[PDB]
Symmetry: C3
Subunit: 329 residues, 3 copies
């Protein structure tokens, strides 16, 4: 049982300028995406899909947060391991969703910013919810990228983003791995968040000038780990450990990690006995927070442009295979 | 009746001038011959020479091409046959210049008196000149589609988004023909309607290029003009296709590739000819071994840099002389 | 002999410092070792260490490279051996800088005293300096060709179009040699004639880059100096080839491709070395297993980003030390 949602972005300047026509109709209430498929030859042809949620070009970042993350974030707190992926063609709002943007000329606080995506929102809520819940807790973040199956550490104290991590099988866990060299930062409070996210962005900006099409060919794994203490009446300590992975996948257009994931998601769906985690860096990193027993969701991002027809259809067929709902009448 | 093939060599462009280019191409209009100098610094004497139905050297103007090639063909179209002219050769050699032409800067001339105007505008002008006089009742429909990455686009459509796609089907009426579903055919009521249409055409293409990669040199351009003629009651229907191919130096090359294969099958006389394997060859099926009369303008550059492509375009053009058609 | 192999590491460039690059390369001139840190953030102790005939760190200047590598080689050329020095490495690591160098801006220095002059300019100076002294009668001729996409171009040709191609034939009076048909070999009567000749070759090369895709990173440069010494009463001939290979990371790459297969076969004493399968390996047949005496300058960047390509340059160069030539 994996959750699959779809988010159509609005038109960019390039599209308005080319007088783009839309071919995507999103029905929030019916949980349906509708695609106009016959160009000039057949005006009536439609292909329709159903998801667990459908957000239009209108959907505000917070609506996405509230609908997708909270119920998931709850499970993380109950001490489980969860992943949310953003998926789709380059240019369709994966990075906008997973992490959002800064409104120009410091105009709201980072946490007030209406353009902020899932990552910065999630961090804000983790403290909010746990500072006032009462118990003792710590919060650790990591951020790494995968490019041509090599691993980079965006939060590392090393000034050269190009120093590469390594990955080993975790002996204390048969579903886990150890990322040798991975920096994890203790986030002591709400007020430590931004500077961390800023240093991470600065490194990524550098990564992109060093390697070709770094932005679209790379996977971002942002990871939060929450540690939750409680003592018993006679002094013994019961730890809960929660783990959320926020994953900004490489662009889907037509990459070992990307195809491999697809097959892992299939193997989980139609329940074929061997699921091929080992095959890619990304599915090995992720394995531990996949399999069921832990909530997984997928935000599929599409474009509304006519130009992006095939790409959009392809995204949708991919999402549909991840979870197959029949259409209502 | 054999495809006629002509060769047109353009003059050097500024970039060639600036790089001090040597010509390696000699045209002899009167013997109808092109001779290419193939041996660089190594062998100053070796040449490859070819004979064609006509050869146009560097200093050939737009009007010369019109009078030698297009006039005789438009008269055949006016007598109710079908004809096709296509431009073949390397990027930058003047396929577009020959097929469409250019507007001289500063509006120095009227569109129909512009000496840079190419075959499509001259032809439209002459369909009108020639038929208003002769006195018959007639109409003229035009269409314009581009093939890019095996997808069909409609330059003249009223739709504002160039990317809306056409579809292609077998004609149940004509065993070699196709139906292009959704293709706007514009009725041209007269000469003074011509320009605006072409200009909307141009602007739509300009948008296509900003949307799609290497659109200009990777796409094929199919311009069609249907003439209905009335003259008890006797009607003739003439059709003329003006095609402007992808750059010959070249999914993405499928129509060019299939064109080549279709041509070889026709010249070697292989029993089965793969027209169906590309959108371009399905559209041209009647021009290539069917009953349309066909002419090819093979364009070439005179520069030494372009030697291998020049040879390639000449060999390819020369063998296409061997294809037999058979009008009405 | 064995092919001599030396390594040159360049300093950081502007982009590397902007990016805050760390070094992963430590050169030890005394031990003749190059040591690369391969563990990144994961593993601080892993290294890969290679011993060469000579190693030049980031602070090495053109003159140091010249005294240690070329002076000895030119001494041998003067006693009439054949010699080859070629530069191998990823794009941007300093092949051209080593073989040719650059001119300092604003005419601050005579070409003879330019601290940035590479091997080619300094050899030509030194050749006259040495022989003007001995008073033995001598002549010097030069030539400079480039290979791109398996085509040959002559940068010293009097022909104004750099794209007129050369061709290549077996040498009838040498089993391992070729003759380049059309190659301008220029007699250099005195040091005062050297600079204008380089200037012209450079300008012809500037034009070539504007005419062909990635011409500078995909082409091989072959500069050849021939020295005739009238001495007994005999002619002694010394040949020096200075070769600047295309980027290692790379018909477009046929010559690099065959260069690798030729090297592999020389290391595994394989029956038939495919010298004929590219223009380059045919030009270099003597220098690769033949009677010519060969040095390879492997060029590398110090930056962590370039780890994979640096190692591969080092593996590739290192193995070429096993190969042996038998000089004159
Ligand atoms: N899409 C932007 C990030 S915006 C953003 C950021 C941008 C510039 C300076 C500091 C932070 C950001 C946007 C809104 C609220 C908080 C953070 C951010 C959010 C999450 C993460 Cl992983 C890293 C950075 C980019 O990658 O260029
Ligand atoms: N060949 C140019 C357009 S020139 C041209 C044109 C250009 C700009 C505005 C209006 C017309 C043109 C040039 C000379 C005489 C008539 C038309 C034209 C000719 C044939 C056709 Cl299919 C479309 C346009 C292009 O590829 O964009
Ligand atoms: N990297 C430069 C060459 S530098 C150089 C040169 C540069 C510009 C004008 C004239 C010469 C050069 C540098 C220092 C001393 C003499 C020559 C040079 C050296 C060898 C040869 Cl084949 C040709 C030219 C280029 O090829 O563009
Ligand atoms: N829902 C949305 N609303 C407004 N702008 C969006 C939306 N989704 C994407 N964008 C814009 O489109 C551009 C590309 O989006 P991006 O997040 O880079 O997509 P991807 O990560 O898939 O490349 C960004 O500059 C962003 O502002
Ligand atoms: N016969 C010719 N006379 C003058 N200019 C020409 C001729 N043929 C081509 N040109 C010029 O060369 C350029 C390339 O021609 P073009 O028609 O665009 O080549 P292609 O369409 O085959 O890529 C244009 O700028 C055009 O003006
Ligand atoms: N040893 C060196 N010392 C100083 N600068 C260098 C050195 N080697 C290379 N460079 C610089 O690196 C740049 C690229 O060098 P180049 O010789 O063009 O590389 P390649 O020919 O291997 O592609 C040049 O602009 C040059 O100034
Ligand atoms: Cl021009
Ligand atoms: Mg992105
Ligand atoms: Mg064109
Ligand atoms: Mg170079």
């Amino acid at each position: 049982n994996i959750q699959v949602v779809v988010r159509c972005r609005p038109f960019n300047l390039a599209e308005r300028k080319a007088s783009a026509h839309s071919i995507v109709e999103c029905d929030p209430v019916r949980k349906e995406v509708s695609v106009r498929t016959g160009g000039l030859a057949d005006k009536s042809s439609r292909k329709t899909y159903t998801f667990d949620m459908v957000f239009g070009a209108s959907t505000k970042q917070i609506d996405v947060y509230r609908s997708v993350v909270c119920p998931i974030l709850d499970e993380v707190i109950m001490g489980y391991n969860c992943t949310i992926f953003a998926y789709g063609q380059t240019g369709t709002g994966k990075t906008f969703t997973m992490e959002g943007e800064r409104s120009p000329n410091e105009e709201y606080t980072w946490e007030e910013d209406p353009l902020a995506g899932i990552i910065p929102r999630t961090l804000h809520q983790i403290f909010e919810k746990l500072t006032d819940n009462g118990t003792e807790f710590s919060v650790k973040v990591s951020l790494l990228e995968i490019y041509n199956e090599e691993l980079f550490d965006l939060l590392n104290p090393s000034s050269d983003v190009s120093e590469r991590l390594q990955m080993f099988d975790d002996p204390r866990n048969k579903r886990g791995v150890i990322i040798k060299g991975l920096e994890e930062i203790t986030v002591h409070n709400k007020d430590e968040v931004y500077q961390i996210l800023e240093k991470g962005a600065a490194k990524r900006t550098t990564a992109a000038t060093l390697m070709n099409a770094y932005s679209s060919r790379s996977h971002s794994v942002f990871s939060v780990t929450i540690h939750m203490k409680e003592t018993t009446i006679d002094g013994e300590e019961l730890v809960k450990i929660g783990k959320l992975n926020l994953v900004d996948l490489a662009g889907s257009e037509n990459n070992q990690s990307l195809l491999t994931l697809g097959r892992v998601i299939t193997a989980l769906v139609e329940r074929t006995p061997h699921v091929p985690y080992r095959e890619s860096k990304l599915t090995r990193i992720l394995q531990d927070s996949l399999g069921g027993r832990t909530r997984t969701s997928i935000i599929a991002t599409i474009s509304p442009a006519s130009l992006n027809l095939e790409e959009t259809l392809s995204t949708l067929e991919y999402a549909h295979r991840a979870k197959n709902i029949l259409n209502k009448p």
